Structure formats: C-alpha cells, structure tokens
Design a protein around this ligand. Structure first.
Ligand code: TPB
Lengths: 427, 552
C-alpha cells in the first residue's frame, strides 16, 4: 500500500494509562483462525510484532461473520475505549440524528474495511496491542500491535469522519431525505420509500462507496436463494410499545384476584396513580382459593380505572444523555424473552420482547446473545449509544459461549443478575 | 559470555530519574572480593569502568555460602526497579501437565548464567551504576556500570525470556518435532528420538545457543527424571504431584490448618475423591493465626480418609489429541462433587472437585451444572476443546429444570451414566391451586428486639393455631409458619404467605440446605402429594395475615 495520509495525534485522558486486560483462553480452532488472519494482516502491513517493552494488552476473539466460511477477528476494545474515545466523543464526537428512528426502514452496512488504510499515530500504537494465546499456555503468546486505525476502537471512526462525510456528500446531495448515521464500523442508512426502491437506493449507495474506493464486503446473496433472504433491515417507525395488560375474565376466583392485586401493587412503582384496596378488600376474607367470587362497589370501577391509566404511557420519563442506558432482560420461557431499557428505576424508556422459533434448533444462550445484540442495535438506532445489560445467566457460562453466536462488530457492557421474581410475571 | 543480540529499548517511569542511593562501609576483605569480581566482570565486558558524568549509584554488597570457595556480588536495585517502565509479564498462568503431550526423552539445560550474556539497552546502562569503595578515603572507590542484565533488575526476566525466544526461532523451525520450554533458570527440551539422536540434537541446540554468547554446561550439579517442577513430578510418560505430607499434630492452629488444606487441594488434581468440606468449615473464622483450633469430629474423620487416599501413589497420563476427552462427575454428598478427565478408562488425565460454597440454598441439579461448567472452563484452558460428559442425571430431569429455571444455561454434549447417587427432583410445587385442598392463611412475625415471636395459620375451614417462638427472626418465623401449615395440613394443600423470602427459598426447590428449618420443610414437601404456595402483599392487603400479626 501507499501512505495515503499523515496521522492524527491521540492522547489518552489525563491520569489514564493504557489498557492491561487479560486474554481469555480460546478454543484450539479459534486460535488457528486468528493466527492465520494475523499473519496476513502482518504482511499487508496492518499490524506489527511487538517487544517486552509493551506492557499493555487488549482482548481478542474469533467469530463467524454472517455465518460465512471464514473467521473474523473481533478485538475487545472496550477498555481502551473508556480510556480514549470518551474524550474523543468530545474532541471528535460523531453527532446522532434524532430522526433515523422515524424512517420507514434502516439498512446497516459494515464499512469497517475503510479504516485499514489510515496509518495510526505512532505514539499511540503501543496501546492497541493484543496477544494471541497458546493452548495450555505452553508457548509464549504471539504479540502484535496496530499500525492503522483498528476496527472496534471508537477512535478509528471518529478520525475517519472527515474522510467519510467527504465520500458521502455527493450522494447525500441527490438523496437529501435518506439519513446516514455512522456508529463505529457500521453505516445506518434510512429511507421512507417502498422497500423495493430503498433496497436499491442502498445498492445505489453501496456502489457509490465501492467506486470511490471503500469496499462494502456485503455481497449477501444474488438470485439463488436457499432460504436466507436476509439483509439487515430494521423498521423503527414500527418500534412501538407493548403495554402489558391485565387479564379479562368472566369468572374471577380468589386465587386469580390475588395475583391481579399483586401485579397491580408492583405496577404502582411505575404508575403511582394505581389503587387496589377495593379489589383487595374482596380478599380480606380467609376463603378457599379455588372459589370464584363477585365484583364490588367500585371494584369493576377500579379494574377499569387502572386498566386505563395502565394503557397510557407515564410522564416525567425523559432521556438524560448525561446518563448511561441500562437494559434488563428476563427469560419468559418457550423462546420468549422480555426487556427494559432505562436510566432510573421504573422510568422505562422502551420495552419490547424477543422470541425465537420452536425447540430442536435453539438453546437459551444463543437466544440471549441474539436478544442482546438485537436490543443493542435498537438502542444505537434510537439514542446513538449502546446500553449495559443486566444479564440473567451465570457469569462463567456467558463468558464461555457469548462468542459462539456473537455476530456484531462491537461489544456492549454487561454484568449478571441472579434475581427477578415478580418482574417475569409483571411483564 | 555476551551476545550480538539486538537490545530491547527500556525507559524509566514518566517523570522519574535514576537512583541516587549510596552506602560506603568497607570490610577490607570484601572490597577485595568485589574488586576481584568486578575485574573478571569488566574484563568479560559485563560491566565497564565509568567516571563522574552524573551516575546514579546503588548499594553494593558481598555474600558467601557454606560449601563456599568463592564470594558473590549482590546489588540491590529495589530503588531502581521502582523507576523502570513495566514489561510484558511472563507467567500469565502455568501450563498444566494434565495437558502435556507425551514424549520419548527430555533434557534441561542450565541457562542461569545466560542473563549476563544478553545486552542491556545502551541508554539505560547509566542507571545500573554502582560504586565499590577502595579502602579508606582519597578515592570514592572504583566505579562501574552494567553492560548486560543486572541480576535483580525488574525488566530482566522479561528482556531475557524475549531474547531467548528469538534465538530459538531458527532452531524451532528446523525442528518442529522438538518442544522447547524455558522456566526461570531452566530450559527443558523434549522430543521423540532415542536418547542417542536426542543428544545429537541437544548438542546442536547447545552449539546454536553458543554462537549467541549464551553458554551452558554438560555435567554440572543437579539430577534428571523425575523432574521436580512447580510442585510436580514429571516423567517422559506420566506425571504426578509432589509427594505430600499430612502432618500429625497434638494441637492445630489456623496456620497449620491452612497449610493442611492447601496441600489437599493440590493433591486433588490427580488423587481421586479427596474431600475438604469439613476441614475448611473450621477455618471459617478468618483472623486468628496462633489461635489453636479444636479439630472437630467430622474434620477428623475426613482428614483420615484423605490419608487412606494419599497412602496410595497415583499418577496421571498425558493428552493424546488423537482421541476424545471424557468427563465424569459424581456427587459425594454435602455440596461435594468430584471428577476425573480421561480419554482412557483406567489411568486418568486429571481430576478435581466442586463444592457450592456460594450462599446457603442451592439445588442438586443446579450444582451439577455449576460443575459441568467449572470443568468446561478448565478444559478450554488446558486442551482447547470441550470434553464429552458422563453424568448421573436423566434428561427428563435436566430438561425439566432448565425449562422451569429463570436463568439461562447451556449444557453441552452429555451422556447419562446410571450409577448411584442420582441427581433428581424430589418434588415440584403445583402451578395451579388444588381444588378441594384446605387453604392455609399462614403468617408469623418476630420482635427484632426481644427475639420473641410466633407462627400461626388460619384456614378456610375455620381451623387455627399460633405457636410461640423464642430466639428467632422474622425470616425464621415466616418459615416456621409454613412448616406449621405443612405439619397440620393433609396430603393436598394450599398455602398463602406474605413473604417473598420464604416464597422464593421454597420455590428454588432446594434439594437441601443445612438450615434444619428449611430441611424439615423440604422433607414435608417431599412427604406431600400436592402443594401450592401463594404470595401476597404483606400489609396493604388480605386480612388473614394481619389477623395473625395482631395475634403475633
Ligand atoms: C517442564 C516442561 C518442559 C516442556 C518441554 C514443556 N512443553 C511441552 C510441550 C508439549 N509436550 C510436553 N510434554 C512433556 C514435558 C516434560 C516432560 C518431562 N519430564 C515430559 C513430557 N511439554 C512444558 C510445558 C514444561
């Protein structure tokens, strides 16, 4: 390659030192993968081999990108990021278009290849360093560092902007209504025209890029369709609320009215305007449980009163961009999971549900992974920033497999919560 | 003695500068030894006479042995290392022999001397500066500087291990068979040639190294197989632990209890069945040291069994990547679980244990999983793949649970191994109230101050009861009220509690828990036919619970 530029100075946040994270042990296969990948990257001249004077270290993995035959290297730049791009979401912050979510449809295309040409400020390299492990740690790990904007590191995109908005402007011109948002390694393009036209404006764009150099290694399919008619296409205007409702019943038993009084009392932490007393007072007795019972004075007035305030969104809930996003996920069972993305308890910003097909082909884990990556994107598309998941899985387990079905270019922040009782029911 | 090896550039932490410590005493005889040492050192180029040009000195010294015939220079760079950059660590983790591939013959070459052969970054020599006083006082003494790698510098293990690795490279390629591994001052080589040829190659290895100023011997001091390493006993075809010693004492103190438990886990990697729950249950007191502890009954019985175990020598086999990796787990009893990993039905590859220390209320099926998981993590690190499991659980069981459980899991490949004990659910609560069954309106509060309380119930059928309790907590009564209903109820019961605590515990479906309360309860649940538990908001709500708390 030829030196297409003159680097840009990157200085960590003051009081901050580079990253020194541990490398997770890998599968024998995954190694061979990276090992191969890295040897090419090395010839190509992207990364270089380093010495003992480089103390730093950041995690790496091997994943299957869109299921193709060959492996893709996914570096876990989550720490170098906090340490850098946080102060690069400033100096070079990339602004988030508050209307991309309203568009009729959004396609996403991997532009990560772009960066592999802009040489990285030499005094910063040391920090990107990663190490490929060896089984049973018998052989000293191989060690490399980046000589170009590595993918995954949120400063790569932030430096490319200039170079990007240039490549795009003479398309954003003759297409002033589609909005293009760039989040790291992906490009979110949104339009309001029948999918047929969209899907074209896309390939229309996909090529603009390709003719101005950027390859969009996204040759998804042709016209030989084994059921895989899939292309990343989201529909944000349909991203609507799922008001969970109370059950309507002809015959109401003691037990039944019981749970109901429960869900409601738990509900009141999100909606304080809810009351039960009159319905509950229909429980004050010590009757059997299988026994059916009658309405009361305003009991029916309450099952309907609340049923209302509970079908209207709660006020006071705004998006503080000063805070982080917290997504909680609960397993509902039978391939069905629900989730809540918020910033303060009970003041939910958005809540959906996810679900995968029937048995014989999918496990929980794969699901969670999916639900996650799904939710994440939603979030990126609506707020321009990924949340932090409170995952209902055993830590270690997650750690072992999250990569097995992980198809995304980025990695969020997560942790593990052994707890949800009523929540499962309430949602 | 010194090589044409390229040097690793080093540096001193950000704002810092060279060490300016001093020390100037003078044992006339020592000063001779050091000046005797220094010469043979500068003459060999490992150091060099430097003169006032801001050198930053450091402490010099001399030491001697009993089987002595010489002396030893021992500088102290403590205040130097506290100024040098950080380097790429060397021992991320130690390789485990349970995952070492078999070999014909091995060999270790002493390479300690070596680090005085590898060059120090020119620009960083000026700091290794020390000064050895002469006799009295017209000269500060004779002044030197290091040219290779100081014996105690921070970045020396590093810069060495690196340099070595680069030098081995040609050899390592021109000989993929040969496995080379360097540890501290050792350089182990292992191949498949018959001793004769092996030593041909070895000597080549040697010659190779020699061209690079790193010398070695052919008949120095120590012994060969077995190779004592990291507390391991290594043989060209098998491997085992360091012979251990279970001390016998009249009075044991924490320190000895610890050091006793420590050795036991270490013997666990290959000795089958070693228990440890009891001996540690003791150490549960965290701050004594010379505080003697009474080895209780259990601990005692336990220790012995590990003796019966240990009395017998046990060795492990190596890993053949040509075959599968099988993993079998059996429950020992009180949260104790054991396992051995093999490819071959007789001799093992490795073994271990798993006891749910965490919390105080877990199920038998959950635990089986935490285990399967503990091992999966293990194999990945050691062999790079997941084993095939053989475990005492029947699908119906398992699948039932992962379906009922609120958390997500992922049990890989697994075959059922019918052999007692057996993991299985002893009971299941009903998902729908049982029609006909009497309905118990359970409750029970306690005085946080007086530790006095009560637990009663009031049924639909008009039946009541209130039992007084002394020395308890609300959670304790909130559990005794439920155990109460159970004792007085029939074979099919409906229970209502205003306690998410008691609720969830019971719900987890605990095989056990030593909390004798929960046990009596768990056992009642087992003796029942149909049970249905029901939660309800404590205060604002029903009148049955309150009706028992006005009582309380
Ligand atoms: C110390 C020691 C010596 C060597 C040569 C290795 N590396 C490897 C790499 C691949 N297979 C083996 N088998 C092996 C190692 C030592 C002995 C002995 N004695 C026998 C077999 N060792 C390690 C990890 C430790």
């Amino acid at each position: 390659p030829i030196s297409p530029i003159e680097t840009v100075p990157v200085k960590l946040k003051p009081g901050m030192d580079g990253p020194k994270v541990k490398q997770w042990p890998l599968t024998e296969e995954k190694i061979k993968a990276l090992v191969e990948i890295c040897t090419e990257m090395e010839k190509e001249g992207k990364i270089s081999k380093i010495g003992p004077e480089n103390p730093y270290n950041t995690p790496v993995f091997a994943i299957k990108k869109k299921d193709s035959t060959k492996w893709r290297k996914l570096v876990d730049f989550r720490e170098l990021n906090k340490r850098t791009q946080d102060f690069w979401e400033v100096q070079l912050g990339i602004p988030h278009p508050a209307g991309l979510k309203k568009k009729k449809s959004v396609t996403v295309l991997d532009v990560g290849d772009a960066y592999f040409s802009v040489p990285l400020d030499e005094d910063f390299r040391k920090y990107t360093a990663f190490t490929i492990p060896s089984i049973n740690n018998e052989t000293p790990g191989i060690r490399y560092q980046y000589n170009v904007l590595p993918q995954g590191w949120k400063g790569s995109p932030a430096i490319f902007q200039s170079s990007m908005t240039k490549i795009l402007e003479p398309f954003k011109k003759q297409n002033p209504d589609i909005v293009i948002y760039q989040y790291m390694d992906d490009l979110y393009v949104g339009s309001d025209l029948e999918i047929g036209q969209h899907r074209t404006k896309i390939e229309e764009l996909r090529q603009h890029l390709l003719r101005w150099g950027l390859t969009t290694p996204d040759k998804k399919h042709q016209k030989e369709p084994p059921f895989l008619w899939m292309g990343y296409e989201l529909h944000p205007d349909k991203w609507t609320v799922q008001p969970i409702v109370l059950p309507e019943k002809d015959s109401w038993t003691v037990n039944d009215i019981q749970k109901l009084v429960g869900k409601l009392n738990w509900a009141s932490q999100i909606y304080p305007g809810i009351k039960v007393r009159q319905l509950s007072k229909l429980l004050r007795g010590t009757k059997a449980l299988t026994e059916v019972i009658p309405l009361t004075e305003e009991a029916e007035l309450e099952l309907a009163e609340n049923r209302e305030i509970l079908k209207e969104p709660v006020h006071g809930v705004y998006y503080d961009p000063s805070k982080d996003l917290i997504a909680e996920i609960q397993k509902q069972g039978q391939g069905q999971w629900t989730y809540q993305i918020y910033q303060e308890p009970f003041k939910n910003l958005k809540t959906g549900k996810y679900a995968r097909m029937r048995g014989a082909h999918t496990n929980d884990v794969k699901q969670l992974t999916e639900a996650v990556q799904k939710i994440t994107t939603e979030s990126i598309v609506i707020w321009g920033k990924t949340p932090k998941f409170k995952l209902p899985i055993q830590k270690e387990t997650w750690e072992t497999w999250w990569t097995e079905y992980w198809q995304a270019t980025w990695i969020p922040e997560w942790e593990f919560v052994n707890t949800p009782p009523l929540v499962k029911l309430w949602y | 003695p010194i090589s044409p090896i390229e040097t690793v550039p080093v540096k001193l932490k950000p704002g810092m500068d060279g060490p300016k410590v001093k020390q100037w005493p003078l044992t006339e005889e020592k000063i001779k030894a050091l000046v005797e040492i220094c010469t043979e050192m500068e003459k060999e180029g490992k150091i060099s006479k430097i003169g006032p040009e801001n050198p930053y000195n450091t402490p010099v010294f001399a030491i001697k042995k009993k089987d002595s015939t010489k002396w030893r220079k021992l500088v102290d760079f403590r205040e130097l290392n506290k100024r040098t950059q950080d380097f790429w660590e060397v021992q991320l983790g130690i390789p485990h022999p349970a995952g070492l591939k078999k070999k014909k013959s091995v060999t270790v070459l002493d390479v300690g001397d070596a680090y005085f052969s590898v060059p120090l970054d020119e620009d960083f020599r000026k700091y290794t500066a020390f000064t050895i006083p002469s006799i009295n006082n017209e000269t500060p003494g004779i002044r030197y500087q290091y040219n290779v790698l100081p014996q105690g510098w921070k970045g020396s293990p590093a810069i060495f291990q690196s340099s070595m690795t680069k030098i081995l490279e040609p050899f390592k390629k021109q000989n993929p068979d040969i496995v080379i591994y360097q540890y501290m001052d050792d350089l182990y080589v292992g191949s498949d040639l018959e001793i004769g040829q092996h030593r041909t190659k070895i000597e080549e290895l040697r010659q190779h190294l020699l061209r690079w100023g790193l010398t070695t011997p052919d008949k120095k001091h120590q012994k060969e197989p077995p190779f004592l390493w990291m507390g391991y006993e290594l043989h060209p075809d098998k491997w085992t632990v360091q012979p251990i010693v279970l001390p016998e004492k009249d009075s044991w103190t924490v320190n000895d209890i610890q050091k006793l438990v420590g050795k036991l886990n270490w013997a666990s990697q290959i000795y089958p069945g070693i228990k440890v729950r009891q001996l540690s249950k003791l150490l549960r007191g965290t701050k004594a040291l010379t505080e003697v502890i009474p080895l209780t009954e259990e601990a005692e019985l336990e220790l012995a069994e590990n003796r019966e175990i240990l009395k017998e020598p046990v060795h492990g086999v190596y890993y053949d990547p040509s075959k599968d990796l099988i993993a079998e787990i059996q429950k020992q009893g009180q949260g104790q679980w054991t396992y051995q990993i093999y490819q071959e039905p007789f001799k093992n590859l490795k073994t271990g244990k798993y006891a749910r220390m965490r919390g105080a209320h877990t199920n038998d099926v959950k635990q089986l999983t935490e285990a399967v998981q503990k091992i999966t993590t293990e194999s990945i690190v050691i062999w790079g793949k997941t084993p095939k499991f053989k475990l005492p659980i029947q699908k119906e069981t398992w699948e039932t649970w992962w379906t009922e459980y609120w958390q997500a899991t992922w049990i890989p490949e697994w075959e059922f191994v019918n052999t007692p004990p057996l993991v299985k659910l002893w009971y299941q609560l009903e998902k729908e109230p049982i029609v006909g069954a009497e309905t118990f309106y359970v409750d029970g509060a306690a005085n946080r101050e007086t530790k006095l309380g009560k637990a009663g119930y009031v049924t639909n059928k008009g039946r009541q009861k209130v039992v007084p309790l002394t020395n308890t907590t609300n959670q304790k009564t909130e559990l005794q009220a439920i155990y109460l209903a159970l004792q007085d109820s029939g074979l099919e019961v409906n229970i209502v509690t205003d306690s998410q605590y008691a609720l969830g515990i019971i719900q987890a479906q605990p095989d056990k828990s030593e909390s004798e309360l929960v046990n009596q309860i768990i056992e009642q649940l087992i003796k029942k036919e149909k049970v249905y538990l029901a939660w309800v908001p404590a205060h604002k709500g029903i009148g049955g619970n309150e009706q028992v708390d006005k009582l309380v």
